[PDB]
Amino acid sequence: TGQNQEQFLLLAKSAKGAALATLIHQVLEAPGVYVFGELLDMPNVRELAESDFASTFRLLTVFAYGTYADYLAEARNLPPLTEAQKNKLRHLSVVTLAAKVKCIPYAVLLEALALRNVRQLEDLVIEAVYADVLRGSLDQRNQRLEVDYSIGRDIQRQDLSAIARTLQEWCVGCEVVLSGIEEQVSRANQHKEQQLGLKQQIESEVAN
Amino acid sequence: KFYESKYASCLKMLDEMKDNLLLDMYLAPHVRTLYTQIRNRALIQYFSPYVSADMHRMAAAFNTTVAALEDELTQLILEG
Protein backbone atom coordinates (compact mmCIF):
# COMPACT_ATOMS: atom_id res chain seq x y z
CA THR A 1 0.00 0.00 0.00
CA GLY A 2 1.08 3.62 -0.65
CA GLN A 3 -1.52 5.64 -2.59
CA ASN A 4 -4.39 4.29 -0.44
CA GLN A 5 -2.50 5.40 2.71
CA GLU A 6 -2.60 9.10 1.75
CA GLN A 7 -6.03 8.78 0.06
CA PHE A 8 -7.66 7.35 3.23
CA LEU A 9 -5.59 9.43 5.72
CA LEU A 10 -7.01 12.56 4.02
CA LEU A 11 -10.49 11.19 4.80
CA ALA A 12 -9.43 9.92 8.26
CA LYS A 13 -8.48 13.42 9.49
CA SER A 14 -11.83 14.75 8.16
CA ALA A 15 -14.25 12.13 9.61
CA LYS A 16 -16.28 11.54 12.78
CA GLY A 17 -17.50 8.54 14.86
CA ALA A 18 -19.97 6.78 12.53
CA ALA A 19 -18.17 7.90 9.35
CA LEU A 20 -14.90 6.44 10.69
CA ALA A 21 -16.71 3.25 11.78
CA THR A 22 -17.98 2.77 8.19
CA LEU A 23 -14.56 3.86 6.78
CA ILE A 24 -13.01 0.90 8.65
CA HIS A 25 -15.44 -1.38 6.74
CA GLN A 26 -14.37 0.44 3.54
CA VAL A 27 -10.55 0.17 4.04
CA LEU A 28 -10.76 -3.57 4.89
CA GLU A 29 -12.91 -4.20 1.78
CA ALA A 30 -10.46 -2.56 -0.66
CA PRO A 31 -7.76 -4.30 -2.75
CA GLY A 32 -4.08 -3.50 -2.04
CA VAL A 33 -4.59 -2.21 1.52
CA TYR A 34 -2.96 -4.88 3.71
CA VAL A 35 -1.21 -2.59 6.27
CA PHE A 36 -3.29 -0.49 8.74
CA GLY A 37 -0.51 0.83 11.02
CA GLU A 38 -1.01 4.55 10.30
CA LEU A 39 -4.82 4.19 10.41
CA LEU A 40 -4.88 2.28 13.76
CA ASP A 41 -2.55 4.88 15.40
CA MET A 42 -4.99 7.77 14.64
CA PRO A 43 -6.62 9.65 17.59
CA ASN A 44 -9.91 9.69 15.63
CA VAL A 45 -9.93 5.86 15.62
CA ARG A 46 -8.62 5.78 19.24
CA GLU A 47 -11.89 7.48 20.26
CA LEU A 48 -13.84 4.50 18.82
CA ALA A 49 -12.04 2.12 21.21
CA GLU A 50 -14.10 1.36 24.37
CA SER A 51 -17.04 3.28 22.81
CA ASP A 52 -20.16 2.58 20.68
CA PHE A 53 -18.07 1.09 17.84
CA ALA A 54 -15.59 -1.04 19.84
CA SER A 55 -15.99 -4.29 17.85
CA THR A 56 -14.94 -2.44 14.66
CA PHE A 57 -11.72 -1.30 16.39
CA ARG A 58 -11.21 -4.92 17.56
CA LEU A 59 -11.79 -6.03 13.95
CA LEU A 60 -9.10 -3.55 12.81
CA THR A 61 -6.79 -4.94 15.54
CA VAL A 62 -7.35 -8.51 14.21
CA PHE A 63 -6.71 -7.30 10.61
CA ALA A 64 -3.48 -5.50 11.66
CA TYR A 65 -2.11 -8.01 14.23
CA GLY A 66 -4.21 -11.22 14.46
CA THR A 67 -5.07 -14.10 12.09
CA TYR A 68 -8.23 -15.70 10.61
CA ALA A 69 -8.37 -18.29 13.42
CA ASP A 70 -8.37 -15.43 15.99
CA TYR A 71 -11.35 -13.94 14.10
CA LEU A 72 -13.16 -17.33 14.13
CA ALA A 73 -12.63 -17.60 17.91
CA GLU A 74 -14.19 -14.14 18.46
CA ALA A 75 -16.69 -14.11 15.52
CA ARG A 76 -19.65 -13.65 17.93
CA ASN A 77 -18.24 -10.27 19.12
CA LEU A 78 -16.65 -9.00 15.87
CA PRO A 79 -18.80 -7.53 13.04
CA PRO A 80 -19.62 -9.82 10.07
CA LEU A 81 -17.29 -9.78 7.03
CA THR A 82 -17.91 -10.50 3.33
CA GLU A 83 -15.98 -13.10 1.26
CA ALA A 84 -13.47 -10.46 0.07
CA GLN A 85 -12.56 -9.41 3.63
CA LYS A 86 -12.39 -13.05 4.80
CA ASN A 87 -10.05 -13.74 1.86
CA LYS A 88 -7.85 -10.71 2.69
CA LEU A 89 -7.55 -11.81 6.34
CA ARG A 90 -6.65 -15.32 5.10
CA HIS A 91 -3.91 -13.80 2.87
CA LEU A 92 -2.52 -12.03 5.93
CA SER A 93 -2.64 -15.30 7.94
CA VAL A 94 -0.59 -16.99 5.20
CA VAL A 95 1.84 -14.04 5.50
CA THR A 96 2.11 -14.75 9.28
CA LEU A 97 2.77 -18.44 8.52
CA ALA A 98 5.36 -17.42 5.91
CA ALA A 99 6.92 -15.10 8.50
CA LYS A 100 7.32 -18.15 10.77
CA VAL A 101 8.68 -20.69 8.24
CA LYS A 102 9.68 -20.81 4.51
CA CYS A 103 8.04 -24.15 3.53
CA ILE A 104 4.39 -24.39 4.69
CA PRO A 105 2.58 -27.76 4.42
CA TYR A 106 -1.01 -27.77 3.06
CA ALA A 107 -2.36 -29.25 6.32
CA VAL A 108 -1.26 -26.27 8.44
CA LEU A 109 -2.71 -23.88 5.81
CA LEU A 110 -6.04 -25.78 5.56
CA GLU A 111 -6.35 -25.79 9.38
CA ALA A 112 -5.31 -22.12 9.86
CA LEU A 113 -7.44 -20.66 7.04
CA ALA A 114 -10.41 -23.03 7.69
CA LEU A 115 -10.62 -24.56 4.20
CA ARG A 116 -12.02 -27.87 2.98
CA ASN A 117 -10.34 -28.77 -0.34
CA VAL A 118 -6.89 -28.11 -1.88
CA ARG A 119 -7.92 -25.93 -4.88
CA GLN A 120 -9.62 -23.33 -2.61
CA LEU A 121 -6.29 -22.99 -0.81
CA GLU A 122 -4.36 -22.97 -4.11
CA ASP A 123 -6.67 -20.31 -5.55
CA LEU A 124 -6.19 -18.17 -2.38
CA VAL A 125 -2.40 -18.45 -2.72
CA ILE A 126 -2.82 -17.43 -6.40
CA GLU A 127 -4.94 -14.41 -5.30
CA ALA A 128 -2.10 -13.59 -2.84
CA VAL A 129 0.64 -13.72 -5.47
CA TYR A 130 -1.56 -11.75 -7.90
CA ALA A 131 -2.15 -8.96 -5.33
CA ASP A 132 1.66 -8.69 -4.74
CA VAL A 133 1.32 -9.90 -1.12
CA LEU A 134 3.31 -13.12 -1.46
CA ARG A 135 5.93 -14.50 -3.79
CA GLY A 136 6.69 -18.18 -4.28
CA SER A 137 5.65 -21.47 -5.84
CA LEU A 138 3.32 -24.34 -4.99
CA ASP A 139 4.43 -28.01 -4.86
CA GLN A 140 1.50 -30.42 -5.41
CA ARG A 141 3.25 -33.80 -4.91
CA ASN A 142 4.84 -33.04 -1.51
CA GLN A 143 1.74 -30.94 -0.63
CA ARG A 144 3.84 -27.88 0.32
CA LEU A 145 3.96 -24.12 -0.33
CA GLU A 146 7.46 -22.74 -1.02
CA VAL A 147 7.59 -19.07 0.02
CA ASP A 148 10.10 -16.75 -1.69
CA TYR A 149 8.97 -13.38 -0.23
CA SER A 150 6.31 -12.19 2.25
CA ILE A 151 5.37 -8.61 3.21
CA GLY A 152 5.28 -6.95 6.67
CA ARG A 153 1.95 -6.48 8.48
CA ASP A 154 2.43 -6.26 12.27
CA ILE A 155 3.94 -3.01 13.59
CA GLN A 156 4.32 -4.09 17.26
CA ARG A 157 5.59 -1.16 19.34
CA GLN A 158 6.26 -3.30 22.42
CA ASP A 159 7.69 -6.33 20.54
CA LEU A 160 9.82 -4.11 18.20
CA SER A 161 12.88 -5.15 20.23
CA ALA A 162 12.63 -8.69 18.75
CA ILE A 163 13.44 -7.29 15.28
CA ALA A 164 16.64 -5.76 16.72
CA ARG A 165 17.27 -9.05 18.59
CA THR A 166 17.54 -10.79 15.20
CA LEU A 167 19.32 -7.85 13.48
CA GLN A 168 22.07 -7.91 16.14
CA GLU A 169 22.16 -11.74 15.81
CA TRP A 170 22.95 -11.12 12.12
CA CYS A 171 25.44 -8.30 12.94
CA VAL A 172 27.41 -10.50 15.37
CA GLY A 173 27.25 -13.20 12.66
CA CYS A 174 28.92 -10.82 10.18
CA GLU A 175 31.40 -9.73 12.87
CA VAL A 176 32.45 -13.40 13.24
CA VAL A 177 32.75 -14.06 9.47
CA LEU A 178 34.78 -10.84 8.95
CA SER A 179 37.22 -11.65 11.77
CA GLY A 180 37.44 -15.24 10.48
CA ILE A 181 38.71 -13.97 7.12
CA GLU A 182 41.05 -11.50 8.79
CA GLU A 183 42.56 -14.51 10.70
CA GLN A 184 42.58 -17.02 7.80
CA VAL A 185 44.23 -14.48 5.44
CA SER A 186 46.85 -13.85 8.14
CA ARG A 187 47.43 -17.63 8.49
CA ALA A 188 47.75 -17.94 4.68
CA ASN A 189 50.63 -15.45 4.91
CA GLN A 190 52.04 -16.92 8.17
CA HIS A 191 52.48 -20.27 6.34
CA LYS A 192 53.81 -18.83 3.05
CA GLU A 193 56.59 -16.66 4.53
CA GLN A 194 57.55 -19.48 6.94
CA GLN A 195 57.86 -21.95 4.06
CA LEU A 196 59.86 -19.42 1.99
CA GLY A 197 62.17 -18.94 4.99
CA LEU A 198 62.56 -22.71 5.38
CA LYS A 199 63.35 -23.04 1.65
CA GLN A 200 66.00 -20.28 2.04
CA GLN A 201 67.62 -22.43 4.78
CA ILE A 202 67.66 -25.56 2.59
CA GLU A 203 69.09 -23.49 -0.29
CA SER A 204 71.81 -22.17 2.08
CA GLU A 205 73.01 -25.75 2.75
CA VAL A 206 73.75 -26.32 -0.97
CA ALA A 207 76.97 -24.26 -0.57
CA ASN A 208 78.29 -26.69 2.09
CA LYS B 1 13.01 -65.13 -35.40
CA PHE B 2 16.11 -64.14 -33.38
CA TYR B 3 16.04 -60.64 -34.95
CA GLU B 4 12.22 -60.33 -34.61
CA SER B 5 12.45 -61.17 -30.83
CA LYS B 6 10.47 -64.42 -31.30
CA TYR B 7 12.75 -66.52 -29.09
CA ALA B 8 10.19 -69.30 -28.43
CA SER B 9 9.92 -70.46 -32.03
CA CYS B 10 13.65 -69.70 -32.55
CA LEU B 11 14.72 -72.10 -29.75
CA LYS B 12 12.05 -74.59 -30.90
CA MET B 13 13.53 -74.74 -34.44
CA LEU B 14 17.08 -74.67 -33.00
CA ASP B 15 16.35 -77.68 -30.74
CA GLU B 16 14.65 -79.38 -33.74
CA MET B 17 17.94 -78.95 -35.68
CA LYS B 18 20.21 -79.93 -32.73
CA ASP B 19 20.09 -83.74 -33.07
CA ASN B 20 20.42 -83.56 -36.88
CA LEU B 21 23.38 -81.13 -36.71
CA LEU B 22 24.98 -83.39 -34.05
CA LEU B 23 25.67 -85.92 -36.86
CA ASP B 24 27.73 -83.45 -38.96
CA MET B 25 31.51 -84.11 -39.11
CA TYR B 26 33.02 -80.63 -38.47
CA LEU B 27 29.98 -78.85 -36.91
CA ALA B 28 29.35 -81.29 -34.00
CA PRO B 29 32.39 -80.54 -31.74
CA HIS B 30 31.09 -76.92 -31.42
CA VAL B 31 27.33 -77.63 -31.08
CA ARG B 32 27.51 -77.09 -27.27
CA THR B 33 29.35 -73.74 -27.47
CA LEU B 34 27.27 -72.25 -30.34
CA TYR B 35 23.90 -73.15 -28.76
CA THR B 36 24.95 -71.82 -25.34
CA GLN B 37 26.30 -68.61 -26.96
CA ILE B 38 23.04 -68.15 -28.94
CA ARG B 39 20.74 -68.79 -25.95
CA ASN B 40 22.72 -66.41 -23.70
CA ARG B 41 22.72 -63.70 -26.39
CA ALA B 42 18.95 -64.18 -26.81
CA LEU B 43 18.41 -63.79 -23.05
CA ILE B 44 20.31 -60.50 -23.18
CA GLN B 45 18.42 -59.32 -26.30
CA TYR B 46 15.15 -60.16 -24.48
CA PHE B 47 15.99 -58.21 -21.33
CA SER B 48 17.69 -55.29 -23.16
CA PRO B 49 14.59 -53.13 -23.57
CA TYR B 50 13.16 -53.82 -20.08
CA VAL B 51 13.58 -52.12 -16.69
CA SER B 52 11.19 -54.54 -14.94
CA ALA B 53 10.32 -57.91 -16.53
CA ASP B 54 8.02 -60.76 -15.53
CA MET B 55 9.92 -64.02 -15.08
CA HIS B 56 6.94 -66.24 -16.03
CA ARG B 57 6.63 -64.67 -19.50
CA MET B 58 10.44 -64.95 -19.83
CA ALA B 59 10.42 -68.62 -18.80
CA ALA B 60 7.59 -69.27 -21.31
CA ALA B 61 9.50 -67.38 -24.04
CA PHE B 62 12.70 -69.39 -23.44
CA ASN B 63 10.97 -72.82 -23.20
CA THR B 64 12.09 -73.41 -19.60
CA THR B 65 10.84 -73.37 -15.98
CA VAL B 66 10.90 -70.27 -13.71
CA ALA B 67 13.39 -71.78 -11.22
CA ALA B 68 15.67 -72.96 -14.08
CA LEU B 69 15.41 -69.46 -15.59
CA GLU B 70 16.24 -68.03 -12.14
CA ASP B 71 19.40 -70.18 -11.95
CA GLU B 72 20.37 -69.33 -15.55
CA LEU B 73 19.82 -65.59 -14.93
CA THR B 74 21.80 -65.74 -11.67
CA GLN B 75 24.71 -67.22 -13.68
CA LEU B 76 24.15 -64.52 -16.36
CA ILE B 77 24.34 -61.70 -13.78
CA LEU B 78 27.39 -63.19 -12.03
CA GLU B 79 29.59 -63.03 -15.19
CA GLY B 80 27.65 -62.03 -18.35
Binding site: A98, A99, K102, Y149, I163, W170, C171, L178 | -
Partner: protein, 281 residues
Protein backbone atom coordinates in the same frame (compact mmCIF):
# COMPACT_ATOMS: atom_id res chain seq x y z
CA UNK C 1 8.54 19.06 -14.05
CA UNK C 2 6.75 17.85 -17.20
CA UNK C 3 6.88 14.01 -17.17
CA UNK C 4 4.48 11.12 -16.26
CA UNK C 5 4.71 10.77 -12.43
CA UNK C 6 2.12 7.97 -12.00
CA UNK C 7 1.71 4.23 -12.67
CA UNK C 8 4.65 1.87 -13.33
CA UNK C 9 5.21 -0.06 -16.61
CA UNK C 10 7.51 -2.99 -17.58
CA UNK C 11 9.70 -2.48 -14.41
CA UNK C 12 12.36 -5.06 -15.32
CA UNK C 13 15.59 -3.48 -16.53
CA UNK C 14 18.92 -5.18 -15.87
CA UNK C 15 21.83 -2.86 -16.64
CA UNK C 16 25.40 -4.07 -17.35
CA UNK C 17 28.20 -1.85 -15.91
CA UNK C 18 29.98 -1.94 -19.31
CA UNK C 19 27.24 0.42 -20.51
CA UNK C 20 27.92 2.87 -17.64
CA UNK C 21 31.65 2.84 -18.49
CA UNK C 22 30.91 3.30 -22.24
CA UNK C 23 28.87 6.43 -21.47
CA UNK C 24 31.46 7.73 -18.95
CA UNK C 25 34.26 7.23 -21.50
CA UNK C 26 32.15 8.93 -24.24
CA UNK C 27 31.58 11.98 -21.99
CA UNK C 28 35.22 12.10 -20.76
CA UNK C 29 36.57 11.90 -24.34
CA UNK C 30 34.24 14.63 -25.73
CA UNK C 31 34.96 16.84 -22.70
CA UNK C 32 38.70 16.27 -23.28
CA UNK C 33 38.36 17.22 -26.98
CA UNK C 34 36.24 20.37 -26.41
CA UNK C 35 37.73 21.51 -23.07
CA UNK C 36 34.22 21.89 -21.65
CA UNK C 37 31.41 19.47 -20.69
CA UNK C 38 29.48 18.23 -23.76
CA UNK C 39 26.11 16.46 -23.83
CA UNK C 40 26.77 13.05 -25.44
CA UNK C 41 24.16 10.78 -27.10
CA UNK C 42 24.11 7.08 -28.00
CA UNK C 43 22.34 3.76 -28.58
CA UNK C 44 21.64 1.01 -26.03
CA UNK C 45 21.72 -2.63 -27.23
CA UNK C 46 20.88 -5.96 -25.62
CA UNK C 47 18.18 -8.60 -25.13
CA UNK C 48 14.47 -8.60 -24.33
CA UNK C 49 13.04 -11.78 -22.73
CA UNK C 50 9.32 -11.06 -22.29
CA UNK C 51 9.05 -8.11 -19.91
CA UNK C 52 12.71 -8.44 -18.82
CA UNK C 53 15.08 -6.07 -20.64
CA UNK C 54 18.84 -6.62 -20.37
CA UNK C 55 20.99 -3.63 -21.38
CA UNK C 56 24.33 -5.18 -22.36
CA UNK C 57 26.24 -2.75 -24.62
CA UNK C 58 26.10 0.72 -26.17
CA UNK C 59 27.59 2.86 -28.93
CA UNK C 60 27.93 6.56 -29.74
CA UNK C 61 25.38 8.18 -32.11
CA UNK C 62 25.79 10.98 -34.64
CA UNK C 63 23.61 14.09 -34.32
CA UNK C 64 23.31 17.68 -35.52
CA UNK C 65 21.42 20.71 -34.16
CA UNK C 66 18.93 22.49 -36.46
CA UNK C 67 18.50 25.98 -34.98
CA UNK C 68 18.05 24.83 -31.33
CA UNK C 69 16.69 21.26 -31.83
CA UNK C 70 18.74 18.02 -31.77
CA UNK C 71 18.39 15.75 -34.84
CA UNK C 72 19.65 12.14 -34.74
CA UNK C 73 21.38 10.98 -37.96
CA UNK C 74 19.21 7.99 -38.88
CA UNK C 75 21.39 6.87 -41.84
CA UNK C 76 24.34 6.63 -39.42
CA UNK C 77 22.32 4.49 -37.02
CA UNK C 78 21.21 2.04 -39.77
CA UNK C 79 24.83 1.79 -40.97
CA UNK C 80 26.01 1.14 -37.38
CA UNK C 81 23.23 -1.47 -36.97
CA UNK C 82 24.43 -3.32 -40.09
CA UNK C 83 27.87 -3.36 -38.41
CA UNK C 84 26.94 -4.49 -34.86
CA UNK C 85 24.58 -7.22 -36.21
CA UNK C 86 27.67 -9.02 -37.64
CA UNK C 87 29.31 -9.51 -34.20
CA UNK C 88 26.34 -9.29 -31.79
CA UNK C 89 23.78 -11.20 -33.89
CA UNK C 90 21.56 -12.06 -30.88
CA UNK C 91 21.39 -8.44 -29.65
CA UNK C 92 18.85 -5.73 -30.52
CA UNK C 93 18.44 -1.93 -30.31
CA UNK C 94 16.67 -1.24 -26.95
CA UNK C 95 16.88 2.53 -26.63
CA UNK C 96 19.16 5.50 -26.15
CA UNK C 97 21.28 7.36 -23.62
CA UNK C 98 22.41 10.91 -22.90
CA UNK C 99 24.07 12.92 -20.12
CA UNK C 100 22.59 15.54 -17.75
CA UNK C 101 20.05 16.19 -14.98
CA UNK C 102 16.32 15.32 -14.94
CA UNK C 103 14.59 14.78 -18.34
CA UNK C 104 13.77 17.91 -20.42
CA UNK C 105 11.87 18.90 -23.64
CA UNK C 106 14.95 18.18 -25.79
CA UNK C 107 15.06 14.60 -24.48
CA UNK C 108 11.39 14.14 -25.47
CA UNK C 109 12.06 15.52 -28.99
CA UNK C 110 14.99 13.11 -29.47
CA UNK C 111 13.01 10.21 -27.86
CA UNK C 112 10.29 10.69 -30.50
CA UNK C 113 12.98 10.40 -33.20
CA UNK C 114 14.18 7.14 -31.61
CA UNK C 115 10.51 6.00 -31.51
CA UNK C 116 10.60 6.27 -35.33
CA UNK C 117 13.26 3.48 -35.27
CA UNK C 118 11.91 1.10 -32.55
CA UNK C 119 8.44 0.85 -30.93
CA UNK C 120 9.09 1.23 -27.16
CA UNK C 121 12.67 2.45 -26.63
CA UNK C 122 14.22 2.89 -23.17
CA UNK C 123 15.83 6.21 -22.23
CA UNK C 124 18.90 6.16 -19.96
CA UNK C 125 20.28 9.34 -18.42
CA UNK C 126 23.67 9.67 -16.71
CA UNK C 127 24.60 12.74 -14.62
CA UNK C 128 28.40 13.20 -14.70
CA UNK C 129 28.14 16.34 -12.51
CA UNK C 130 26.20 14.78 -9.63
CA UNK C 131 26.25 16.40 -6.16
CA UNK C 132 24.66 13.37 -4.46
CA UNK C 133 25.81 10.05 -2.95
CA UNK C 134 23.76 7.62 -5.09
CA UNK C 135 24.73 6.28 -8.53
CA UNK C 136 23.69 9.03 -10.98
CA UNK C 137 21.98 6.73 -13.51
CA UNK C 138 18.23 6.74 -14.26
CA UNK C 139 16.14 4.74 -16.76
CA UNK C 140 12.78 5.80 -18.22
CA UNK C 141 9.96 4.53 -20.45
CA UNK C 142 7.75 6.82 -22.55
CA UNK C 143 3.98 7.09 -22.02
CA UNK C 144 1.60 8.86 -24.40
CA UNK C 145 -1.10 10.72 -22.41
CA UNK C 146 -3.88 13.28 -23.05
CA UNK C 147 -3.68 16.53 -21.02
CA UNK C 148 -6.34 19.18 -21.81
CA UNK C 149 -7.06 17.61 -25.22
CA UNK C 150 -3.38 17.52 -26.27
CA UNK C 151 -1.90 14.06 -26.88
CA UNK C 152 1.62 14.39 -25.47
CA UNK C 153 4.60 12.18 -24.64
CA UNK C 154 5.97 11.92 -21.08
CA UNK C 155 8.67 9.85 -19.30
CA UNK C 156 7.99 7.39 -16.47
CA UNK C 157 11.01 6.28 -14.42
CA UNK C 158 11.78 2.56 -14.10
CA UNK C 159 13.77 0.90 -11.34
CA UNK C 160 16.76 -1.16 -12.45
CA UNK C 161 19.22 -3.72 -11.16
CA UNK C 162 22.88 -4.30 -12.02
CA UNK C 163 23.91 -7.36 -14.11
CA UNK C 164 25.12 -10.63 -12.54
CA UNK C 165 27.83 -11.69 -15.02
CA UNK C 166 30.75 -13.37 -13.23
CA UNK C 167 33.50 -12.25 -15.66
CA UNK C 168 32.13 -8.71 -15.60
CA UNK C 169 32.03 -8.71 -11.77
CA UNK C 170 35.71 -9.78 -11.63
CA UNK C 171 36.68 -7.17 -14.25
CA UNK C 172 34.76 -4.37 -12.50
CA UNK C 173 36.19 -5.46 -9.12
CA UNK C 174 39.74 -5.58 -10.55
CA UNK C 175 39.24 -2.09 -12.08
CA UNK C 176 37.81 -0.67 -8.81
CA UNK C 177 40.63 -2.21 -6.68
CA UNK C 178 43.62 -1.38 -9.01
CA UNK C 179 46.58 -2.39 -6.83
CA UNK C 180 49.26 -15.85 -1.13
CA UNK C 181 46.43 -17.41 -3.17
CA UNK C 182 43.95 -17.09 -0.25
CA UNK C 183 44.85 -13.56 1.01
CA UNK C 184 44.01 -11.85 -2.33
CA UNK C 185 40.94 -14.00 -3.16
CA UNK C 186 38.80 -13.29 -0.05
CA UNK C 187 39.52 -9.53 0.10
CA UNK C 188 36.58 -8.66 -2.24
CA UNK C 189 34.31 -10.84 -0.08
CA UNK C 190 35.69 -9.18 3.10
CA UNK C 191 34.84 -5.72 1.65
CA UNK C 192 31.39 -6.93 0.49
CA UNK C 193 30.66 -8.38 3.95
CA UNK C 194 31.91 -5.13 5.55
CA UNK C 195 29.48 -3.16 3.35
CA UNK C 196 26.61 -5.53 4.31
CA UNK C 197 27.57 -5.27 8.00
CA UNK C 198 27.40 -1.45 7.69
CA UNK C 199 23.92 -1.56 6.11
CA UNK C 200 22.77 -4.07 8.75
CA UNK C 201 24.18 -1.85 11.55
CA UNK C 202 22.56 1.35 10.13
CA UNK C 203 19.13 -0.35 9.88
CA UNK C 204 19.54 -1.82 13.41
CA UNK C 205 20.40 1.62 14.78
CA UNK C 206 17.34 3.11 13.06
CA UNK C 207 15.19 0.40 14.72
CA UNK C 208 16.60 1.14 18.21
CA UNK C 209 16.31 4.93 17.68
CA UNK C 210 12.63 4.51 16.73
CA UNK C 211 11.87 2.15 19.65
CA UNK C 212 13.78 4.18 22.28
CA UNK C 213 12.02 7.38 21.12
CA UNK C 214 13.09 10.92 20.04
CA UNK C 215 13.62 9.83 16.38
CA UNK C 216 10.29 9.87 14.42
CA UNK C 217 8.28 6.61 14.44
CA UNK C 218 7.41 5.11 11.06
CA UNK C 219 4.97 2.31 10.44
CA UNK C 220 6.23 1.63 6.92
CA UNK C 221 10.03 1.46 7.38
CA UNK C 222 10.07 -0.69 10.57
CA UNK C 223 7.45 -2.86 8.83
CA UNK C 224 9.96 -3.49 6.03
CA UNK C 225 12.68 -4.15 8.65
CA UNK C 226 10.28 -6.74 10.13
CA UNK C 227 9.81 -8.17 6.59
CA UNK C 228 13.64 -8.25 6.25
CA UNK C 229 14.03 -10.06 9.60
CA UNK C 230 11.55 -12.73 8.42
CA UNK C 231 13.64 -13.38 5.27
CA UNK C 232 16.41 -14.96 7.46
CA UNK C 233 17.59 -17.81 7.19
CA UNK C 234 17.64 -17.97 3.41
CA UNK C 235 16.99 -21.59 2.25
CA UNK C 236 16.60 -24.00 5.22
CA UNK C 237 14.98 -26.81 3.15
CA UNK C 238 16.30 -30.42 3.16
CA UNK C 239 16.84 -30.37 -0.64
CA UNK C 240 19.20 -27.42 -0.24
CA UNK C 241 21.03 -29.18 2.64
CA UNK C 242 21.50 -32.28 0.45
CA UNK C 243 22.78 -30.07 -2.42
CA UNK C 244 25.09 -27.96 -0.21
CA UNK C 245 26.65 -31.07 1.33
CA UNK C 246 26.83 -32.61 -2.21
CA UNK C 247 28.91 -29.56 -3.30
CA UNK C 248 31.05 -29.82 -0.17
CA UNK C 249 31.69 -33.57 -0.59
CA UNK C 250 32.55 -33.09 -4.29
CA UNK C 251 35.16 -30.40 -3.51
CA UNK C 252 36.25 -32.53 -0.52
CA UNK C 253 36.84 -35.64 -2.66
CA UNK C 254 38.60 -33.51 -5.28
CA UNK C 255 40.85 -32.03 -2.59
CA UNK C 256 41.63 -35.55 -1.32
CA UNK C 257 42.63 -36.71 -4.85
CA UNK C 258 44.75 -33.53 -5.33
CA UNK C 259 46.57 -34.07 -2.01
CA UNK C 260 47.10 -37.72 -3.05
CA UNK C 261 48.73 -36.50 -6.31
CA UNK C 262 51.04 -34.11 -4.40
CA UNK C 263 52.00 -36.84 -1.89
CA UNK C 264 52.62 -39.23 -4.82
CA UNK C 265 55.09 -36.63 -6.17
CA UNK C 266 56.78 -36.14 -2.75
CA UNK C 267 57.09 -39.95 -2.45
CA UNK C 268 58.68 -40.04 -5.93
CA UNK C 269 61.27 -37.37 -4.97
CA UNK C 270 62.20 -39.19 -1.74
CA UNK C 271 62.61 -42.64 -3.41
CA UNK C 272 64.63 -41.06 -6.28
CA UNK C 273 67.10 -39.63 -3.71
CA UNK C 274 67.05 -42.70 -1.39
CA UNK C 275 68.07 -44.95 -4.34
CA UNK C 276 71.16 -42.74 -4.82
CA UNK C 277 72.38 -42.20 -1.21
CA UNK C 278 71.30 -45.31 0.77
CA UNK C 279 71.36 -47.61 -2.29
CA UNK C 280 73.55 -48.22 -5.36
CA UNK C 281 70.52 -48.03 -7.75
Amino acid sequence: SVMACGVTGSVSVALHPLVILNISDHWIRMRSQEGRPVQVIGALIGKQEGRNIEVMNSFELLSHTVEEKIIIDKEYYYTKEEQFKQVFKELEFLGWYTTGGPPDPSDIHVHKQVCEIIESPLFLKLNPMTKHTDLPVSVFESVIDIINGEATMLFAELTYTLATEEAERIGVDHVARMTSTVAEHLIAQHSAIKMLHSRVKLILEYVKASEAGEVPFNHEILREAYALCHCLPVLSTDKFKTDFYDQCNDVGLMAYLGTITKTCNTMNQFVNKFNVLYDRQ
